[PDB]
């Protein structure tokens, strides 16, 4: 996985010859070119050169080029982070998530979550999988691969988890639960629609729409309680929620459209009675480690295509760089 | 005639304070989260918007958290959840955010309008970017998100004048005079304007 | 004068004594005072309940057709003048208030019944 | 309010629908004075006696 881009189409091998140039232009407060920050990235050769870059990218975050931090400038730092440690300063970059702005949503994301189980590294695989829900993602086959990691900690962690980590679990099953393959991705979405709907009468719908992209709509349990009909046309967590709600700031609602603390008897038989069919028509950790094997033909065909698409990038931009310094 | 040499010099030196050393967008649109005042300006806000500043979220405090700042995304006004239950929204083509801001925000963008499910092309400027009534439409629920499907009489004295003029003009013409409202369209009040129709203060 | 932000607001303007006020319509200008200059001469208004109780307003409408058709602006009390007349339709400030006091009269016919 | 808001609207519609009539009538009078059916007789006749 490492030795494919590392035919890097060579450049010079100094860093402080550049480090006295970008800050100098920042003390002119003029913008900095897009190939000149990657050239500060593909010359990293120690541990100390990692942390000068996270200054400099944080400085490059405050530049008249808010964009032009290209995604391959990220990847040629992903390979540097995956080379040296990829343990704390790779994740500390994702921690701020606005001050560095990496957003690695491609098969580069698949370069960085297969190798966390290769060091088994418990405490922080929660955090990166938390930090792809906040990206709009899962058009790549990481859909199985995302919920593959959260079922590892569903067995590891069983608490109230936080104020907001109830939502941190269901949204990492529901967008993974867009599966036309099985009943399993139609089983993972129900865990999402349950746990997102349990703060509905506990804290409020503003919990649902703080930061991770859910909807302002009220209905998520009824979405599960309509697709559980399709499961009966073509689950040990929602019974616990079915009793606890009937167990013991601005207005959003209309007084005509009824409060859903008054539908709790109407939530019981609407959920219970169709599970009789679901024994009569038709564990969770191990059935997705099958999807690790039966699926994943390892689509690097959009990875190496991007690598040759990045020879298209650097050459036609160093060509116009050649234009700007001859007209002087 | 006697020329005004100094007042022309301060016409332009003021005007090269008007572009050059301006306070950028996060220095004056910064707010107080306790008293709900503002640094560098000082004034406070009307009663319908004190909590909305404190509780809810901007147009580009949010969009500074996405790959390419959400280059093709969808967004609605918060009262366009509350005034049109029909989908009424904005899309995105280009971002001009700000770099001076720690917690980068307060920027500018534009893109496609579509009012109440009525689509328009040749994208115009998005409004109210500084406000906190702007809602981040997720990637799920898009194809069902887009869920969308003469004349009045004249006032009384103008009835009597035109008709009695017609028997002066010769023909009686009791034919009911009816002015056309079909020429004039029916624009509502939360329909957004051009943002460069406003200048920055 | 070069007035910046200039637009004809069509106004009655006071020109009468104290305690018998008397407003005069001229095609007024926005930022000037009540008794400032204007665009053109119009025909005045009587707020005085006189002999046999009449309170007169004049209208040459061969020009009040023309002068809003010259792109003029208007404010609230004169929408009461032409909506009441039959040349313009009526404004939503009598539609509330003729019925608002009818909601006060309905509050008063119970008031005259909760005493008797 | 809400029935008055459409009455604000149905104020705003018809007199605007009258307003285009108010504009064009004097624009039929800047046109009758300039290019009216007797005004064309003016343009020929003022040269007709004069020659």
């Amino acid at each position: 996985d490492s030795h494919k881009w590392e035919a890097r189409e060579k450049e010079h091998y100094c860093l402080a010859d550049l480090a006295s140039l970008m800050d100098k232009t920042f003390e002119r407060k003029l913008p900095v070119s897009s190939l000149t920050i990657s050239r500060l990235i593909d010359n990293i050769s120690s541990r100390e050169e990692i942390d000068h870059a996270e200054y400099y990218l944080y400085k490059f975050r405050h530049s008249p080029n808010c964009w032009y931090l290209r995604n391959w400038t990220i990847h040629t730092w992903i390979r540097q982070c995956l080379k040296y440690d990829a343990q704390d300063k790779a994740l500390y970059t994702l921690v701020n998530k606005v001050q560095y702005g990496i957003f690695p949503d491609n098969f580069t994301f698949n370069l960085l979550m297969d190798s966390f189980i290769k060091k088994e590294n418990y405490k922080d695989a929660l955090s990166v999988v938390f930090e792809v829900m906040m990206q709009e993602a899962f058009e790549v086959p990481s859909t199985q691969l995302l919920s593959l990691y959260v079922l590892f900690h569903c067995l590891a962690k069983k608490t109230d988890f936080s104020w907001e980590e109830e939502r941190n679990f269901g949204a990492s099953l529901l967008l993974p639960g867009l599966k036309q393959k099985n009943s399993v991705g139609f089983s993972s979405q129900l865990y999402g629609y349950a746990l997102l709907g349990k703060v509905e009468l506990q804290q409020g719908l503003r919990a649902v729409y703080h930061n991770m992209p859910l909807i302002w709509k009220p209905g998520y349990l009824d979405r599960a309680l309509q697709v559980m009909e399709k499961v009966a046309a073509s689950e040990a967590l929602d019974v616990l929620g079915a009793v606890l709600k009937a167990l013991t700031k601005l207005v959003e609602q209309l007084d005509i459209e009824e409060t859903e603390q008054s539908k709790l008897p109407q939530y019981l038989e609407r959920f219970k009675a169709l599970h009789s069919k679901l024994q009569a028509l038709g564990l969770t950790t191990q059935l997705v480690k099958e999807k690790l094997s039966t699926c994943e033909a390892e689509d690097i065909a959009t990875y190496e295509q991007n690598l040759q698409q990045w020879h298209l990038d650097l050459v036609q931009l160093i060509q116009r760089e050649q234009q700007q310094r001859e007209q002087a | 005639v006697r020329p005004r040499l100094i007042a022309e010099l301060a016409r332009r030196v003021r005007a090269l304070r008007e572009q050059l050393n301006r306070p950028r967008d996060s220095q004056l649109y910064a707010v107080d989260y306790e008293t709900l005042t503002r640094p560098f300006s000082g004034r406070r806000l009307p009663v319908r918007a004190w909590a909305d500043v404190r509780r809810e979220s901007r147009l580009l405090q949010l969009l500074g958290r996405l790959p390419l700042f959400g280059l093709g995304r969808l967004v609605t006004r918060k009262s366009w959840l509350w005034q049109h239950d029909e989908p009424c929204y904005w899309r995105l083509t280009r971002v001009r955010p700000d770099y001076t801001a720690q917690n980068l925000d307060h920027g500018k963008a534009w893109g496609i309008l579509t009012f109440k499910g009525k689509t328009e092309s040749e994208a115009r400027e998005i409004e109210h970017v500084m406000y906190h009534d702007w809602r981040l439409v997720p990637k799920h629920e898009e194809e069902a998100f887009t869920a969308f499907t003469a004349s009045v009489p004249y006032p009384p004295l103008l009835r009597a004048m035109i008709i009695a003029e017609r028997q002066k003009n010769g023909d009686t013409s009791t034919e009911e005079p009816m002015l056309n409202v079909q020429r004039i369209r029916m624009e509502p009040w939360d329909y957004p304007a051009k943002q460069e129709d406003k200048g920055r203060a | 004068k070069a007035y910046r932000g200039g637009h004809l607001t069509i106004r009655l303007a006071l020109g009468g004594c104290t305690n018998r006020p008397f407003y005069r319509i001229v095609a007024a200008h926005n930022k000037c005072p009540r008794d400032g200059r204007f665009v053109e001469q119009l025909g005045s208004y009587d707020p005085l309940p006189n002999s046999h109780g009449e309170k007169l307003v004049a209208l040459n409408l061969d020009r009040i057709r023309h002068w809003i058709g010259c792109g003029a602006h208007l404010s609230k009390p004169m929408e009461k003048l032409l909506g009441l007349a039959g040349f313009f339709p009526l404004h939503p400030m009598m539609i509330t208030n003729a019925e608002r006091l009818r909601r006060k009269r309905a509050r008063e016919v119970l008031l005259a019944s909760q005493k008797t | 309010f809400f029935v008055l808001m459409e009455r604000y609207q149905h104020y705003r519609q018809t007199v605007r629908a009258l307003r285009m009539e108010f504009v064009s009538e004097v624009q039929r009078k800047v046109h009758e004075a300039r290019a009216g059916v007797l005004a064309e007789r003016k343009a020929l006749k003022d040269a007709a006696e004069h020659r």
Binding site: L250, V251, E252, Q253, L254, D255, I256, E257 | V47, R48, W82, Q83 | E99, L101, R102, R103, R105, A106, V109 | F1, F2, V3
Partner: peptide, 29 residues
Amino acid sequence: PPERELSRLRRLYQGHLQEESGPPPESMP
């Protein structure tokens, strides 16, 4: 007006709302 539309205006103005009758009486003497 219809009440579901009127429910929107109730939904906006929690802290400051009055309660009113609908139609007026047809006459007053």
